[PDB]
Amino acid sequence: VDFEIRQKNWNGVREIYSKYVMAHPQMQTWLKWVRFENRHGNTEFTRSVYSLAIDTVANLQNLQIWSDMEVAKLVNSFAHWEAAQQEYERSSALYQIAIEKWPSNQLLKAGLLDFEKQFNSIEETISYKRKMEYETILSNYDTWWLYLDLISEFPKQIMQTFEK
Amino acid sequence: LVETWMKRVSLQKSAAEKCNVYSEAILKIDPRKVGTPGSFGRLWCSYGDLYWRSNAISTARELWTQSLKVPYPYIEDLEEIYLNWADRELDVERAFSILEDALHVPTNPEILLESLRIWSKYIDYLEAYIFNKTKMAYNTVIDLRPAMAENFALFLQNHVMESFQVYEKTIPLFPPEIQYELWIEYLEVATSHPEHIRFLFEKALKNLCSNGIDCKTIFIAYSVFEERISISKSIEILRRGAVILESRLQLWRMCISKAESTSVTRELYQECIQISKAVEFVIKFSDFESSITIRAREILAYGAKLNTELWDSFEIFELKXXXXXXXXXXXXXXXXXX
């Protein structure tokens, strides 16, 4: 790629990037490609690339690739690209789709929360705080966790988890 | 560049004669005023100033001519004319007019790119001069890119919701001197008054780990915040932050402070001590032991084993025993031997 960038042209490189996913279906690859398109002038292809990547993720949804982490990272990157761009509606839709299409949404929810914070407050504090409780649980400030839940709540889960 | 201004200087003895030289030389083409100066050059500006000295309407019109005379590939050329036209206008409707002009400039410069000093000036104008518009300018300025100012103004006129989104702005200004920004926001957020705040603090901490600057301070902010909310596990949070070289030294001092403020205390002492600075830490925790006779003695011995200030410590311990003193002599002798 470096050679083909040191080579001044920016076509056929595209094809090899496409193939570079084919050999290394890794999110790092995709991210690198996106970075390249960032160097590239035409922003249309950047979005197009994102669309492609997301589509591929969708298609091979089931456990046959990378973990939740990589996908989360991808979604985050996409979200911030869109954030630079105009259409936040589509970002929102994607987020909803993401939570819809994917379960086990700790990473995903976290990213979403962050975006919300950037771009509501109660929600952010709520979900994020809850995550902190989960994190808290993982550590053991368990009292602090339960208390937090109680305050934040929902109240059935506060008292059920409180009992627990 | 200087020749023109020399001519003008000569003219200055009387009225506009070689000011008209400048006017003539600059009005022929852009190359003689804009192209002559590699960087920004106040020739048009100079003319305007001269006219100002002479009269007001003529100065405004001369100045207008300057504006019309489009400068070269240079920054802050027509901003000083627009600044001397803003102040002049004011000396708050004419000033507003200059602000409108500034707005155009902002639009036109941003547009041109796809002006920073100019932007700042605009902000100063819209803030000093009603509030929403100023906010808008702030937003625009942010996009283009200080936020402290925004926070301050917001705090003042709107009296923490304006400074909450100002806090967001600071967060979003991922530009350098960001640790300070985050810290300032945190400070404001506690004083303007909560779990959201805590979360924010955490975020700041985790993200600003490779700062190497006010890590101790950050830790204090965290632990302090926790205390305010409430407690001792938050002292362990501070401790943790402090435990994670010379920034870390300061951290460890912070830990010491916390730990002296504090079984759990003993644990803390053990930690900090274990973590040259280490020797000092040992002195600290050894002292702590001294507060907490056998165990303390052991601790002291351990510390010693890790130069002459340690002798003093040992002596002190021996006060807290004839046999102990004898031991002290023994250990001291051994140390000397080494």
PDB file of N, CA and C in Angstrom, chain B residues 67 78 81-83 85-86 94-109 118 122:
ATOM      1  N   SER B  67     -10.341  48.888   2.277  1.00  0.00           N
ATOM      2  CA  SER B  67     -11.086  47.615   2.278  1.00  0.00           C
ATOM      3  C   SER B  67     -11.243  47.105   0.850  1.00  0.00           C
ATOM      4  N   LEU B  78      -7.026  43.570   6.571  1.00  0.00           N
ATOM      5  CA  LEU B  78      -8.263  44.362   6.647  1.00  0.00           C
ATOM      6  C   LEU B  78      -8.968  44.292   8.011  1.00  0.00           C
ATOM      7  N   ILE B  81      -8.059  47.630   9.869  1.00  0.00           N
ATOM      8  CA  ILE B  81      -8.920  48.672   9.297  1.00  0.00           C
ATOM      9  C   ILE B  81     -10.359  48.532   9.800  1.00  0.00           C
ATOM     10  N   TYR B  82     -10.856  47.295   9.849  1.00  0.00           N
ATOM     11  CA  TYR B  82     -12.171  46.988  10.429  1.00  0.00           C
ATOM     12  C   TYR B  82     -12.219  47.193  11.950  1.00  0.00           C
ATOM     13  N   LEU B  83     -11.068  47.075  12.617  1.00  0.00           N
ATOM     14  CA  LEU B  83     -10.937  47.361  14.053  1.00  0.00           C
ATOM     15  C   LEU B  83     -10.914  48.866  14.330  1.00  0.00           C
ATOM     16  N   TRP B  85     -12.153  50.949  12.230  1.00  0.00           N
ATOM     17  CA  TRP B  85     -13.507  51.331  11.799  1.00  0.00           C
ATOM     18  C   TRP B  85     -14.589  50.924  12.808  1.00  0.00           C
ATOM     19  N   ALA B  86     -14.360  49.840  13.557  1.00  0.00           N
ATOM     20  CA  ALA B  86     -15.285  49.409  14.636  1.00  0.00           C
ATOM     21  C   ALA B  86     -15.301  50.364  15.823  1.00  0.00           C
ATOM     22  N   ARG B  94     -23.100  51.606  15.232  1.00  0.00           N
ATOM     23  CA  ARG B  94     -21.971  51.569  14.296  1.00  0.00           C
ATOM     24  C   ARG B  94     -21.043  50.406  14.623  1.00  0.00           C
ATOM     25  N   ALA B  95     -20.809  50.190  15.915  1.00  0.00           N
ATOM     26  CA  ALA B  95     -20.011  49.047  16.367  1.00  0.00           C
ATOM     27  C   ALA B  95     -20.663  47.755  15.959  1.00  0.00           C
ATOM     28  N   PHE B  96     -21.987  47.674  16.066  1.00  0.00           N
ATOM     29  CA  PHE B  96     -22.737  46.510  15.573  1.00  0.00           C
ATOM     30  C   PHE B  96     -22.486  46.297  14.086  1.00  0.00           C
ATOM     31  N   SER B  97     -22.505  47.396  13.338  1.00  0.00           N
ATOM     32  CA  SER B  97     -22.252  47.394  11.905  1.00  0.00           C
ATOM     33  C   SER B  97     -20.884  46.785  11.608  1.00  0.00           C
ATOM     34  N   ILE B  98     -19.890  47.217  12.367  1.00  0.00           N
ATOM     35  CA  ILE B  98     -18.551  46.607  12.271  1.00  0.00           C
ATOM     36  C   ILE B  98     -18.591  45.146  12.621  1.00  0.00           C
ATOM     37  N   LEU B  99     -19.463  44.742  13.549  1.00  0.00           N
ATOM     38  CA  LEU B  99     -19.662  43.366  13.942  1.00  0.00           C
ATOM     39  C   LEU B  99     -20.295  42.536  12.842  1.00  0.00           C
ATOM     40  N   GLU B 100     -21.260  43.130  12.157  1.00  0.00           N
ATOM     41  CA  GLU B 100     -21.858  42.539  10.943  1.00  0.00           C
ATOM     42  C   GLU B 100     -20.796  42.289   9.891  1.00  0.00           C
ATOM     43  N   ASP B 101     -19.962  43.303   9.706  1.00  0.00           N
ATOM     44  CA  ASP B 101     -18.800  43.250   8.797  1.00  0.00           C
ATOM     45  C   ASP B 101     -17.899  42.087   9.170  1.00  0.00           C
ATOM     46  N   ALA B 102     -17.639  41.972  10.481  1.00  0.00           N
ATOM     47  CA  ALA B 102     -16.858  40.863  11.037  1.00  0.00           C
ATOM     48  C   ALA B 102     -17.536  39.548  10.712  1.00  0.00           C
ATOM     49  N   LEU B 103     -18.857  39.488  10.828  1.00  0.00           N
ATOM     50  CA  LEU B 103     -19.611  38.288  10.518  1.00  0.00           C
ATOM     51  C   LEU B 103     -19.383  37.854   9.076  1.00  0.00           C
ATOM     52  N   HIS B 104     -19.447  38.843   8.194  1.00  0.00           N
ATOM     53  CA  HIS B 104     -19.200  38.631   6.753  1.00  0.00           C
ATOM     54  C   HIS B 104     -17.801  38.059   6.548  1.00  0.00           C
ATOM     55  N   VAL B 105     -16.843  38.665   7.247  1.00  0.00           N
ATOM     56  CA  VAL B 105     -15.439  38.274   7.177  1.00  0.00           C
ATOM     57  C   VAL B 105     -15.284  36.803   7.565  1.00  0.00           C
ATOM     58  N   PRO B 106     -15.958  36.441   8.664  1.00  0.00           N
ATOM     59  CA  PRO B 106     -15.943  35.087   9.195  1.00  0.00           C
ATOM     60  C   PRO B 106     -16.481  34.117   8.151  1.00  0.00           C
ATOM     61  N   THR B 107     -17.624  34.496   7.589  1.00  0.00           N
ATOM     62  CA  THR B 107     -18.295  33.705   6.547  1.00  0.00           C
ATOM     63  C   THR B 107     -17.358  33.575   5.343  1.00  0.00           C
ATOM     64  N   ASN B 108     -16.781  34.715   4.950  1.00  0.00           N
ATOM     65  CA  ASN B 108     -16.019  34.857   3.724  1.00  0.00           C
ATOM     66  C   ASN B 108     -14.672  34.206   3.819  1.00  0.00           C
ATOM     67  N   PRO B 109     -14.050  34.250   5.015  1.00  0.00           N
ATOM     68  CA  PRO B 109     -12.742  33.673   5.251  1.00  0.00           C
ATOM     69  C   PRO B 109     -12.824  32.173   5.388  1.00  0.00           C
ATOM     70  N   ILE B 118      -8.949  37.802  13.824  1.00  0.00           N
ATOM     71  CA  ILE B 118     -10.191  38.475  13.430  1.00  0.00           C
ATOM     72  C   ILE B 118     -11.370  37.858  14.173  1.00  0.00           C
ATOM     73  N   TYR B 122     -13.954  39.497  16.854  1.00  0.00           N
ATOM     74  CA  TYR B 122     -15.396  39.379  16.659  1.00  0.00           C
ATOM     75  C   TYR B 122     -16.071  38.934  17.957  1.00  0.00           C
TER      76      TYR B 122
END
